[PDB]
Design a protein around this ligand. Structure first.
Ligand SMILES: Nc1nc2c(ncn2[C@@H]2O[C@H](COP(=O)(O)OP(=O)(O)NP(=O)(O)O)[C@@H](O)[C@H]2O)c(=O)[nH]1
Ligand SMILES: Nc1nc2c(ncn2[C@@H]2O[C@H](COP(=O)(O)OP(=O)(O)NP(=O)(O)O)[C@@H](O)[C@H]2O)c(=O)[nH]1
Ligand SMILES: [Mg+2]
Ligand SMILES: [Mg+2]
Lengths: 155, 155
């Protein structure tokens, strides 16, 4: 910052993801694989930022790795901080993104990902109310993205 | 985010700024006004992000407010965390930016800003060695910006 003294707060982990909207304002979400009979929760395409690599590039890379979609970062939306039980800090970065044209959703099925898909604003609202969105920040950023693009707001 | 539980670490303040490079790779820096007064230290154009407002837009706004230059954010470079003595956290955001053409540097002289100017890579290296760069992160991000644009690295 400026001249008022402050100490450094080391952030060991950083993650980057995107709020990817299509032409209708639907959001691209990734689902966790399980949790016995409960479905895994949903989150935005996002993954770890390699130490030293640009978080913006990581967001783009991760989106493609998880959904098979090449995306273009449109605008930075925000970053927020979390702390694991052991004290490790993680800074999550989020960008508004748009998919490049002529692509087919093809999720990467792993022990961490069950699938990925576009969800409408209306159904997202239901998922959120149902407690199926892992990080509530997803709703906050989806709302921001909708406003930025000029789409109607969540129900 | 991705299912391992973590707590929220509230960040009360957010700042946004830019590493603005011209066609030669010179960097735009802002100088503090004093304190034993002579020679205030240098920092990138940066200012407080209004609560709720987009940090990227804030970086662009602040750059214009402090230097008189309208700038275009080119790419996100990074964000880092600091803590004031009272415990308040501040998250600083940095973008690589380019000035729009046909502009004249016209700094905003206030009780916080002595002036602003473009400094060459060579002189920046001297300023840094001389301990005249308030936040060392400035050198780290300047280095990142130079690599991104394809300019030679700092001495
Ligand atoms: N408890 C705990 N969790 C950790 C630790 N280190 C990493 N993690 C977890 O490992 C994750 C690393 O993945 P990350 O890059 O954040 O990806 P992500 O985008 O959050 N996952 P997604 O979105 O696919 O579910 C963190 O989000 C965090 O949950 C640790 O020391 N302790
Ligand atoms: N010690 C201390 N200083 C504070 C606190 N809040 C604000 N400040 C000081 O007040 C200044 C202005 O507020 P802040 O939002 O941090 O400014 P900024 O936009 O980040 N500044 P800059 O653009 O120059 O980096 C800061 O640069 C910091 O020096 C606080 O709780 N404790
Ligand atoms: Mg990964
Ligand atoms: Mg200000």
């Amino acid at each position: 910052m400026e001249h008022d003294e402050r100490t450094h707060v080391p952030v060991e982990l950083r993650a980057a993801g995107v709020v990817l909207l299509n032409e209708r304002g639907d959001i691209l979400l990734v689902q966790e694989k399980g949790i016995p009979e409960k479905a895994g929760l949903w989150h935005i395409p996002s993954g770890a930022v390699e130490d030293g690599e640009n978080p913006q590039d990581a967001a783009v890379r991760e989106a493609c790795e998880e959904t098979g979609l090449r995306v273009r970062p449109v605008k930075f939306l925000g970053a927020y901080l979390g702390r694991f039980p052991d004290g490790v800090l993680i800074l999550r970065h989020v960008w508004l993104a748009e998919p490049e044209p002529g692509q087919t959703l093809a999720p990467a099925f792993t022990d961490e990902i069950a699938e990925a898909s576009f969800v409408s604003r209306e159904d997202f609202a239901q998922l959120y109310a149902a407690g199926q969105i892992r990080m509530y920040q997803t709703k906050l950023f989806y709302a921001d993205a909708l406003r930025e693009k000029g789409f109607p707001a969540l129900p």
